[PDB]
């Protein structure tokens, strides 16, 4: 806890269906799931904030969250891996 948003996420593999990457830069407002939870297609996973606008990130299909890369109030660049699902 000297850097909190100065951790570096890896980059999503664009050609991996289970990698969800950030679509633009901004802010994690609220992580809504843990490594291990099962989810349904279209479930709230993540609320981000872009430039004063809230976007909700959803499950693409049904499955199992395998890694969650961010914490409330971390910052993100286009392309950052946010979640793995199966």
């Amino acid at each position: 806890n000297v850097h909190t948003n100065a951790n570096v996420k890896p980059k999503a593999d664009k050609s991996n269906p289970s990698h969800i990457g950030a679509q633009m830069p901004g802010s994690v407002t609220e992580v809504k799931v843990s490594v291990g939870e099962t989810v349904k297609a279209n479930q709230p996973l993540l609320i981000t904030e872009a430039m004063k606008m809230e976007t909700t990130i959803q499950a693409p299909f049904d499955g199992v969250i395998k890694q969650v890369t961010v914490n409330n109030g971390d910052t993100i660049a286009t392309g950052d891996l946010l979640i793995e699902i199966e």
Binding site: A50, M51, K52, M53
Partner: protein, 90 residues
């Protein structure tokens, strides 16, 4: 309040007594009146500090002049286009 007193004909006449207030219900139709000036300074203040939705946070760009061509307004009043034509023939 005082403003409303100043305006009152009972006041102006000299008529009034000590019961002049209790006796004069309208002294209390004061209306909360704006300051547009302030609210503007508050808008600018807020956007300056916290940005605007969907605008990339960044110093206010230097833009170009494009000084804006105008046409005198009495010259415009002399034109007769498809507006006037509708007024005539429907």
């Amino acid at each position: 309040f005082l403003i409303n007193v100043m305006k009152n004909k009972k006041f102006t006449s000299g008529d009034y007594t000590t019961k002049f207030i209790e006796e004069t219900p309208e002294l209390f139709d004061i209306q909360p009146s704006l300051d547009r000036g302030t609210k503007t300074l508050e808008y600018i203040g807020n956007v300056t500090i916290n940005g605007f939705p969907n605008v990339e946070k960044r110093p206010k760009p230097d833009y170009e002049l494009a000084s804006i061509p105008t046409v005198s307004s009495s010259k415009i009043a002399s034109f007769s286009g498809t507006k006037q034509l509708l007024d005539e023939v429907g």
